[PDB]
Amino acid sequence: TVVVTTILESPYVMMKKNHEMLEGNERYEGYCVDLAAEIAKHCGFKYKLTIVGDGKYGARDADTKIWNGMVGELVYGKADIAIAPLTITLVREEVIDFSKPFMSLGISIMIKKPQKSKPGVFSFLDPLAYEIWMCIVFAYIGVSVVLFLVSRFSPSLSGRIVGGVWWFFTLIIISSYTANLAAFLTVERMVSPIESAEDLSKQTEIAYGTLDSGSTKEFFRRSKIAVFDKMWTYMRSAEPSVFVRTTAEGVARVRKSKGKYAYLLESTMNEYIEQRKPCDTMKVGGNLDSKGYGIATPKGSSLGNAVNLAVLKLNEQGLLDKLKNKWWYDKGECGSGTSALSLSNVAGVFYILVGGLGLAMLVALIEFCYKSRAEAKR
Amino acid sequence: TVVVTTILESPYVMMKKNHEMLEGNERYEGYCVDLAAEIAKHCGFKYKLTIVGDGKYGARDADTKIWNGMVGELVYGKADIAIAPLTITLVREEVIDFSKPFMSLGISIMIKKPQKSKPGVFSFLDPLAYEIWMCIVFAYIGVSVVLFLVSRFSPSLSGRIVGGVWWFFTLIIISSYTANLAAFLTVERMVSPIESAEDLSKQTEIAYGTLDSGSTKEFFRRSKIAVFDKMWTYMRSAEPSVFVRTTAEGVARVRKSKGKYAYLLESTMNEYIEQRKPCDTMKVGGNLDSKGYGIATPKGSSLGNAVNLAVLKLNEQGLLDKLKNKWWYDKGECGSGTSALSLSNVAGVFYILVGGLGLAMLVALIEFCYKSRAEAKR
Amino acid sequence: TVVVTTILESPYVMMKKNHEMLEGNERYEGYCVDLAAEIAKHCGFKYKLTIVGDGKYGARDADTKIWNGMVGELVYGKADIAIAPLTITLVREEVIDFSKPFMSLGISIMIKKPQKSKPGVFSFLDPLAYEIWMCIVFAYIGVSVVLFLVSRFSPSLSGRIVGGVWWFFTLIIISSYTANLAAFLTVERMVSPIESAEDLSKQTEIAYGTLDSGSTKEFFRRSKIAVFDKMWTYMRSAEPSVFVRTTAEGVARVRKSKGKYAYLLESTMNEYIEQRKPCDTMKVGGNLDSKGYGIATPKGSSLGNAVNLAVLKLNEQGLLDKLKNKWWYDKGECGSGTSALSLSNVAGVFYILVGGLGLAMLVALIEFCYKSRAEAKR
Amino acid sequence: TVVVTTILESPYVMMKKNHEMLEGNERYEGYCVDLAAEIAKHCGFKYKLTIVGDGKYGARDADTKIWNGMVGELVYGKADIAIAPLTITLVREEVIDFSKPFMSLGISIMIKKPQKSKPGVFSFLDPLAYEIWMCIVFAYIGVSVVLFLVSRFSPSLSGRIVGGVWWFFTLIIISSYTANLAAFLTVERMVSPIESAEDLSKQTEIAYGTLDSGSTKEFFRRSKIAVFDKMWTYMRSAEPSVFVRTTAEGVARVRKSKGKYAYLLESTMNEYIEQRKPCDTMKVGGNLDSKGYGIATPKGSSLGNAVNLAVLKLNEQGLLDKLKNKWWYDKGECGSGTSALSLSNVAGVFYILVGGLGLAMLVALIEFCYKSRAEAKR
Amino acid sequence: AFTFAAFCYMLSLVLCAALIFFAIWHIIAFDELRTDARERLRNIERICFLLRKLVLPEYSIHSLFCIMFLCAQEWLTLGLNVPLLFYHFWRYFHCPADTLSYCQKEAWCKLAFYLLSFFYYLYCMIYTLVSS
Amino acid sequence: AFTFAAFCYMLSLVLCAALIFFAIWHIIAFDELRTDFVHARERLRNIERICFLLRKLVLPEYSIHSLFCIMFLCAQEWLTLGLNVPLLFYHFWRYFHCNADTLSYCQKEAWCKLAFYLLSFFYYLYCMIYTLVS
Amino acid sequence: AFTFAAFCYMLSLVLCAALIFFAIWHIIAFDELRTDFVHARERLRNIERICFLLRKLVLPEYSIHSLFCIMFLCAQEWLTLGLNVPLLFYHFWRYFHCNADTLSYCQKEAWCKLAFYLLSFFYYLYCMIYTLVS
Amino acid sequence: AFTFAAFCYMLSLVLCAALIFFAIWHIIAFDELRTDARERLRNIERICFLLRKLVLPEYSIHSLFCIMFLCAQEWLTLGLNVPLLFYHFWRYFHCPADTLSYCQKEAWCKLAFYLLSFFYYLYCMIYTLVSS
């Protein structure tokens, strides 16, 4: 047989529901499981779907350079093959053989999908441009003035056409406003201003953090680019600590930080979460960097070429995409993805009303104190 | 002889109103009864009816390898012929000579009969809360009061500006109400309830379930169809469980739920129910699978070649269609069971209208009195 | 090998594009072709996909009882098997062996899908019920009367509340009409009044006919039921000749008879046409009768049982439905299935306007001829 | 040493502004050029660049069984190494040692950049024809004339009824205009252009095509995926042919078509085009397949183990991302390339408004003159 | 529950509610005029003004009742009104306006008629509202 | 079958109704004035009243006939307009063209004008008829 | 943070503006009348004018104060209403309760009423403030 | 192409189109009054009526121009109007109304100012309309 070492991470390595009631390879399941199955089919052999000890992918010690993780196994003979989401690195390849990537990915972004924004106190103007509002106002006052100038400037054949054209105008205005507002309220399209990481670099309202220790953090510290360097500057000079200690921590933070946080992680885990519950997240933009999970094998082996060839065979056979759709989207729970009108949507209207009302009232008061004063005193 | 084993399933076979008061074939009644009558009239033979003890149609036990039900009755000489809704199958075709299908059928859908058309009296206030209606009313009265004050103590400009601001206000208000109402109407309009099974595969708001175990579920399994594959994927991940106990339970749970649940069963049974009280069901989705019920007989018999002929003759003379009509619609407890706006949606408007009219007439009368009396007399 | 006799009818038997450039079974294609392929797979043998001579399914001669068609072949040894859409009948089975139906079907209806109806001269009232219109009218006149009764019946505090409530009323009315009309014009739901054959039996505006010679015509002549007997009475006593001589004739008739004709035929051909061009037809209701296309084989043969078993094997394997979806829907062209407002939609409004206008004009004329007459003469 | 065979494909490799004026590696320029520079700087070797004669990457001929292109150059000693966008494949992996992917990529979509936002001046008249606008205008003037006549020769009832009928008329008119405008707006609102390939599979208004022949089409074939299966079914039944000649043709035919056609190509090439003039394209659909470009070498070589290390080191230092940015965006001819209503849609309203205002002022002035002059003077 | 006839009944109800007070004022004015110089002349003429004035309203509202109950398919109640239409036509033809007896008689009869039509319309509305 | 000309034609005949009415009324006024041609004070008051009504019934003719012409124009109709134009010519001529002697001509003027308006009413109805169905 | 009581409160203080204004104007009128208490004809005309204005400025007080009360009621507010009620009691008392001697009381009446209205203005603004943010 | 300032320019244009005729009538009225019993008294008073009347319109329309060109961010043209606002404030403070010379002088100057603002607004609208 073969010593297959991997680690428990979904949807790659998952324990069957009745794992305690089972003893064998049937316990495990996921992506890499069927992957190793097809790999053995191609080559032909027996394999024991074991697990890593320290629950680590692979790294070394700065002082003892001891490989901890699957790397330590495939290097120290404890294992013969590692079919897991093992990231490919310069150092890890300098010691063993990495097959061609079976899963290309890259760092991505995770946020909470757009929720219904604040009522927008002055939102009833959103259907139209402020310029159109000012034009309506000035047209109203100009028409009133013209009417004033056909009574003193003349004793009608003028108020008729003026009234008619004003009727036409207000008609079309009412209709346009109603139609646009109905279109707004019917479909309810949602969008967030974050379609990339450049946007996050520009603004600073919503925050963003990373796992306090991981490849992503070092990459951000490194990668001296105008954008990523700026984001590292921010996350280094920013309070409170935007970083986290685990993944689910950042996920729950974004969930409770609905509109002011965003977590960066492997695009695979992001696409996975987005399909899991509570279906209240989303990935935006594209992969910042580009990495690849590929098979591993000790430096001197015999499956290197066979596995490297089977990987391309599957990538061309439309099989890796099949397994991915299975374990990410078909299995996905988020396969799916009117209300009344509150006062907050129209409060500005009543504010304007009260304003104009008090204004007319003060005008009348001063006009009275002038008219009566003049008529009495004179 | 001629023994005839059957089963008690309505309306195919049932007990007469007073079966204990009768002794013989006159006891039972149903589609299959008249069918056997016609078969005897054709082949010219006397028969004796019997019921199956096991209450099951027929099947093999993985441990005994012994057919049961009427199938076993025939195979084991306990019966001469079977006249019942005995589904045709390959396993059963290997032990008997199924006649030609006297009734074609398949899997269907069942849902709640939609009659939810009881609109509230003040439904027209649903587009926006009373919190805004009261503001509107008090704004109207305040603007009236202020126009009154102005034109009273200054017999202009204040009048012009209050007119303009009220113009703006009422504009926005009517437009908002109209738009939200149009949203409600449109959304309620473009909702196709169901037209086929795919309507359920591409949605999850309405759950769909089947019986605990039966040929229905088995067909949903081992099915190449991607649609049925996805539907089985869904039902297998049901929480709560879409699968239910005896059909009565799956029927009642949709009889109670407005439109949240659907039950998949035999098209014939669905049609039978749709014609039964409380006539709160319906069947729209065309039959998914295509099967047929047939008359069985012991393989080494002499009637199959004399039975298929009668079945075909009756299917050609429409007698079978006549019997189906009789036992489904003529015997049906349910005889046969728009876009515009009904007054029921706008009643409160006219109610408050007439209320205001009467109030105004009363006020006018009391003012007429308090004026004329106090002036001419006092 | 085997003598496979069939006939050219789509989507069962179709010649490949390069049929002249080919010589063999690869020429043909369709449903029954793959059917026979899987049948031979099950049993195991060679077959020559030949064709019938007279281009007829099967029948006899009233005088010479000579079987013309595939029946003549399987009876006179000219063939060994007939995998075609051969209808199962009493007479045809009295001579040979019919397998269990592989395709259940029944007579259906074919019409032209609903097109945008006439503008509906008085359609602008469709959004609301005539009762609501009359109520609007009577409320307007009653309010005008009440206003008349607060000026002569009294010299305001009455016109204020009356004006306000009337403003509220007309507001809600405008909004409701606008919203309902927008909902009508946005989605544009289409429906025909023909959801079954009972409807065709009731009305007589739109006509319906059948092939002047075929199983359908005789069935309609026969089948003494309140409905089908009535439809036969109609089509027998009706001018011009509703019948036709072929199928495409009736199809083109319905196409050019857009809203006053409907053709009855096998549901299979109907579902087939509905997916072909010009995608301007549709099937409604359900199968009136119930028939089945099944395999045929001479009276005494050896494939009878094997074929009867393979048929059920396929029906249970979800294969017949697969081939059907392939040759009817996947191959189907009709995989898919705003405007301005013409004057015809609102002509009634201008008619009403001119009516009221001339009415007021005549009223004014007579009022003048009375007032001036009295003032001059007296 | 070191021979380096390449190919002329932009921006990977190109000719300098004046290549004839230069002799050596300084002649060419591109991503691959700086890549080879970095590889030499890492491994410390001098190289000499060359171009392939066949202008093809590499493939076998079914008759010769002889690789061509740079693949053959390497296999046949004509080249020491290849630095080009040489897609990784299984057949090619069997003859050389592909380095690790220096650039991941896949199949993408291309469409026309939507900027069609040039609304007509009188677009607000589109909801209904001028045939109705003229009727409305003349109805207004006729009602004015008739009210004038009435109040003139009868100084009522006619006034009340004309007011009521005009109320009804204007009600219906504004409601109809508003509703049709809302229909237009909403319909134009709920149109998701594209988000993935499935958006095309479930529609047929926008055709989609690929190159005449290539790995793209081959992937679309032999693909288990039901989505790609349906897309290949569609493209195979294309009429006219969606497949096209050299990519330039498929690009231009969508450059001309507004949104009727889409072209599927390499994600890298699509991104390159999107940054090229006339900047009338875009790429939204995520990469469908997952492949990568790599540096090749003769199997029995000594650099692969010295080349994969450099490739990984550069991918980790972000140098490759820097080069991609340089050669796509920094060198891009295109820098980086709402819901409410703009004044452009309502200009004609204010135009006719001011026209009527000026006409009224002119009429008032001439009336003032003809009155004052003729009265006080004459 | 509404059926569009309850609306006409409510309208006729609110109108007859004013008609009854109209007729009561008529009766009381006749009682006060029964007194039969400048004081009495004014007390008579200023009231004959209102009398001769408030004549068209009756015709208008009665024709309105007729038209409504005709368009609402309510025939059983129209026959209870057409006789008053004939009476009003005869009045327009020839109406005396010795005269106090006839006037008070017609006033009392019309008042009773309107008070009864009140209850009639009320019961009809009540019956139509709950006819579901 | 509307064409925007049916509305114009029906409106035109509507207005022609009162046009005919006013023509007949002017004819009757001229007839009673001819008959006529303190009883003197009463006749003076009566003729003052009738002349006031006449002078009040001048602008409407111009207005509605100009409306006829302009609506016929705006409807791309070019066979009836040309028939209403001469009347507009006469109208504009009346200003710088125009009791015991003047009535002699006003009588025939009103008579011919009434005949013209009646003929125009019939023609407009015929046009609306054979244009509303096509 | 609207509650439907903020609108009522802001409207109430708006109206209280002119309430204070009219109170001060009545105070000034009473002061000039006290000073006063053909020159006689001129004084008579002036006092007639001022009394006409007064009698014209009576109904608005009742109207707007009743509006205050009814809107406070319709807003489920029950701490300010109870403070405006006594003024309504006094108003309805004025009918069957009520120059050279009457001004002696009208002076203090208007003074106390102005104080009440000013205090109510401040209280309404405070209520709107600490109710508009929550 | 519109930019919301062409609207204010069109409005000021239609208003100055009336202002120019206003000032021309002013000038002609002064010319006719230069004649300086009951006939002349009336010919003077009936015209002084219109003069003293048509005073508020100028203030109103000028303040309107100012407010509009302020809200349209059009500053280059507001400074061409604020001096007239100061002039009108000074007039409201103290205005003589010996007097024919001053009146005709101010009339002519304001007429020229309005005629020039006409062309100014016209050119500004033309430049703003095709600034695409």
Curated annotation (Swiss-Prot), chains A, B, C, D:
- Looking at the UniProt record, the site noted as Interaction with the cone snail toxin Con-ikot-ikot sits at 60, 221, 313
Induction (record text): Down-regulated in the pyramidal cell layer of CA1 in the hippocampus by global ischemia.
| Subcellular location, record wording | Cell membrane; Postsynaptic cell membrane; Postsynaptic density membrane
- Post-translational events: Palmitoylated. Depalmitoylated upon L-glutamate stimulation. In contrast, Cys-369 palmitoylation does not affect cell surface expression but regulates stimulation-dependent endocytosis. Ubiquitinated by RNF167, leading to its degradation.
Mark the transmembrane ranges.
130-150, 157-177, 346-366
Annotated site residue numbers, Crucial to convey clamshell closure to channel opening: 194
Tissue-level expression: Detected in forebrain. Detected in dendrites of neuronal cells. Expressed in the pyramidal cell layers of CA1 and CA3 and in the granule cell layer of the dentate gyrus.
Subunit organization: Homotetramer or heterotetramer of pore-forming glutamate receptor subunits. Tetramers may be formed by the dimerization of dimers. May interact with MPP4. Forms a ternary complex with GRIP1 and CSPG4. Interacts with ATAD1 in an ATP-dependent manner. ATAD1-catalyzed ATP hydrolysis disrupts binding to ATAD1 and to GRIP1 and leads to AMPAR complex disassembly. Interacts with GRIP2. Interacts with GRIP1. Interacts with NSF via its C-terminus. Interacts with CACNG2, PICK1 and GRIP2. Interacts with GRIA1 and SYNDIG1. Part of a complex containing GRIA2, NSF and NAPA and/or NAPB.
Tell me the function of this protein.
Ionotropic glutamate receptor that functions as a ligand-gated cation channel, gated by L-glutamate and glutamatergic agonists such as alpha-amino-3-hydroxy-5-methyl-4-isoxazolepropionic acid (AMPA), quisqualic acid, and kainic acid. L-glutamate acts as an excitatory neurotransmitter at many synapses in the central nervous system and plays an important role in fast excitatory synaptic transmission.
What is the protein's given name? Glutamate receptor 2
Gene name, per UniProt, is Gria2
UniProtKB/Swiss-Prot annotation, chains E, H:
Domain of life (superkingdom): Eukaryota
Record keywords? Cell membrane, Membrane, Postsynaptic cell membrane, Synapse, Transmembrane, Transmembrane helix
A molecular function (GO) held by this record is: channel regulator activity
Q: Which GO terms describe its biological process?
A: localization within membrane; neurotransmitter receptor localization to postsynaptic specialization membrane; regulation of AMPA receptor activity; regulation of membrane potential; synaptic transmission, glutamatergic; vesicle-mediated transport
Q: Where in the cell is it found?
A: Postsynaptic cell membrane
Of which family is this protein a member?
Belongs to the cornichon family.
Q: What is the protein name given in its UniProt record?
A: Protein cornichon homolog 3
Q: Which organism is it from?
A: Mus musculus
UniProtKB/Swiss-Prot annotation, chains F, G:
This protein is called: Protein cornichon homolog 3
Lumenal compartment segments? 31-62
What is the species listed in this Swiss-Prot or TrEMBL entry? Mus musculus (Mouse)
Which ranges does the record mark as transmembrane? 10-30, 63-83, 114-134
Q: InterPro entries from the xrefs?
A: Cornichon (IPR003377), Cornichon_conserved (IPR033466)
Name the gene that codes for it: Cnih3
Q: How does it sit in the membrane?
A: Multi-pass membrane protein
Q: How does it assemble?
A: Acts as an auxiliary subunit for AMPA-selective glutamate receptors (AMPARs). Found in a complex with GRIA1, GRIA2, GRIA3, GRIA4, CNIH2, CACNG2, CACNG3, CACNG4, CACNG5, CACNG7 and CACNG8.
- State which ranges are Cytoplasmic (membrane side): 1-9, 84-113
